[PDB]
Amino acid sequence: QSACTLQPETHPPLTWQKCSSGGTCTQQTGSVVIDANWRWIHATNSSTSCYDGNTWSSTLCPDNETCTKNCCLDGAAYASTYGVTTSGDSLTIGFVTQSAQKNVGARLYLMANDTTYQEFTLLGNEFSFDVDVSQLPCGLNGALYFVSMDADGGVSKYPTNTAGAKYGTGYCDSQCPRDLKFINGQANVEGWEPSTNNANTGIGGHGSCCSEMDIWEANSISEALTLHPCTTVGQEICEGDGCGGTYSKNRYGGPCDPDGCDWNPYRLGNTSFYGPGPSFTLDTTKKLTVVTQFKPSGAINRYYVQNGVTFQQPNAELGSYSGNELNDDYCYAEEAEFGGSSFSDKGGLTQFKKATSGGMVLVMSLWDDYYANMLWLDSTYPTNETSSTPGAVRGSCSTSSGDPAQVESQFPNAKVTFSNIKFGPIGSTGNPSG
Ligand SMILES: *[C@@H]1O[C@H](CO)[C@@H](O)[C@H](O)[C@H]1NC(C)=O
Numbered sequence: 001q002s003a004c005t006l007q008p009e010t011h012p013p014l015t016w017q018k019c020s021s022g023g024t025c026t027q028q029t030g031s032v033v034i035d036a037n038w039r040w041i042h043a044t045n046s047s048t049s050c051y052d053g054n055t056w057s058s059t060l061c062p063d064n065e066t067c068t069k070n071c072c073l074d075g076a077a078y079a080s081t082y083g084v085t086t087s088g089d090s091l092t093i094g095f096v097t098q099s100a101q102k103n104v105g106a107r108l109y110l111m112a113n114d115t116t117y118q119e120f121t122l123l124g125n126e127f128s129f130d131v132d133v134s135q136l137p138c139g140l141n142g143a144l145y146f147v148s149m150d151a152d153g154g155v156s157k158y159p160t161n162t163a164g165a166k167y168g169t170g171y172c173d174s175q176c177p178r179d180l181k182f183i184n185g186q187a188n189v190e191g192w193e194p195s196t197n198n199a200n201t202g203i204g205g206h207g208s209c210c211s212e213m214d215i216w217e218a219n220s221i222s223e224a225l226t227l228h229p230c231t232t233v234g235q236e237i238c239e240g241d242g243c244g245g246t247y248s249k250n251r252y253g254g255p256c257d258p259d260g261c262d263w264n265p266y267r268l269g270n271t272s273f274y275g276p277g278p279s280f281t282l283d284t285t286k287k288l289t290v291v292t293q294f295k296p297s298g299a300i301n302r303y304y305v306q307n308g309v310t311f312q313q314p315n316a317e318l319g320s321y322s323g324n325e326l327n328d329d330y331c332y333a334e335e336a337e338f339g340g341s342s343f344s345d346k347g348g349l350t351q352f353k354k355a356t357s358g359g360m361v362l363v364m365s366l367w368d369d370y371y372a373n374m375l376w377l378d379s380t381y382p383t384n385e386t387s388s389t390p391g392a393v394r395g396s397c398s399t400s401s402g403d404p405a406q407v408e409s410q411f412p413n414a415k416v417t418f419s420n421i422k423f424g425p426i427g428s429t430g431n432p433s434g
């Protein structure tokens with residue numbers, strides 16, 4: 001895509017802290033940018049839309065190539081259109097923002113500068129953030145995660161992408177998403193079909209795959225961390241059934257693991273660790289700190305901080321596994337007890353370590369789920385089962401919760417706040433903020 005400038009693009013600022021093992025942290029000045037899919041796409045030389053509702057212009061976008069020629073991405077009014085605002089080290093995303101049109105949620109990337117996403121090498125380092133999920137009911141997900149995107153959002157690889165990271169291009173994840181309007185410098189017009197239940201979205205012929213580290217998939221009721229390896233580490237186009245994921249004859253037919261090896265303390269049998277009010281170890285009505293450590297072996301350690309108390313990830317027992325570190329033994333035991341071989345089939349932690357050894361881009365988002373009502377996160381899934389099937393219960397939300405129309409209507413003012421991001425060698429982020 002090219003970029004037009006009826007709405008000049010200025011990214012909201014966000015400070016964060018970079019820490020050293022020698023005991024110090026110092027302030028970094030970043031900023032956030034909204035993903036291309038949330039942007040107005042119009043004719044390069046007028047206000048006529050190329051994409052409107054959930055379908056492309058037949059006159060302007062007959063094929064991928066003509067569409068990319070005729071059309072452009074424009075800038076975002078972050079606060080007034082998208083309900084995205086920042087203050088110091090704090091970022092808030094509103095759920096439903098009503099302007100001239102209704103906007104639902106957002107997906108944002110942390111930038112190093114105006115034209116470059118911030119790349120983090122996670123392996124051997126730790127990532128800490130604060131989060132307030134108190135305004136997130138069943139069905140919502142304030143996600144913080146990492147994907148193997150290119151720093152320039154694909155500019156050096158695709159001559160017809162001139163918008164780049166400045167306009168939030170280059171998204172990929174382990175779902176190999178086909179709902180993207182631009183992939184690899186080109187419009188996803190060919191094979192586009194409008195969603196049957198979403199007035200604003202659809203599915204194209206092509207998708208965009210890469211490695212995904214889900215640090216935080218969470219609302220006030222449930223939280224999970226999930227690792228998704230792919231056979232090609234970085235961003236790659238896929239076509240149709242080649243994409244696997246949600247849309248394909250074979251969910252598992254693509255280069256990525258869509259399921260992931262997950263750790264949800266509730267799903268694992270600890271139902272008093274995380275929830276709203278004083279009866280939980282972590283009280284979700286209040287801000288909490290989440291720290292994630294990437295052991296050089298490829299294992300993962302997790303701790304939390306609330307009201308100045310440090311809580312380890314609760315010990316879990318599963319098959320032959322016992323402990324609180326996400327390692328090879330945990331992920332094998334999870335498949336053994338809960339079923340599936342997707343994670344292992346795609347190379348497991350060894351493959352995933354290839355992603356964490358390179359750069360990954362930080363993503364912060366807020367969404368509802370038009371495919372599965374977020375039930376896989378916070379409820380019983382699939383819904384025909386009870387807690388008799390191991391792994392089926394992931395949270396205490398009713399199986400009739402999370403319908404998008406319902407939550408968009410009842411909780412339009414829901415929101416997530418991410419703040420106080422800190423990154424450095426393992427053991428370093430507890431150091432005094434700069
Ligand atoms: C932003 O960072 C990129 C990536 O190295 C660099 O090439 C570019 O010159 C930078 N822009 C500015 C204004 O510093």
Ligand SMILES: *[C@@H]1O[C@H](CO)[C@@H](O)[C@H](O)[C@H]1NC(C)=O
Pocket residue numbers: 064065181182183184186187188189190204205206237
């Ligand atoms: C669009 O179509 C062309 C040629 O048919 C294809 O090579 C390209 O990868 C497609 N791009 C997208 C984003 O779907």
Ligand SMILES: *[C@@H]1O[C@H](CO)[C@@H](O)[C@H](O)[C@H]1NC(C)=O
Pocket residue numbers: 269270271272273281311312313314315
């Ligand atoms: C849940 O985790 C908390 C905090 O670590 C712990 O005190 C408690 O014993 C755990 N409960 C179960 C059922 O394992």
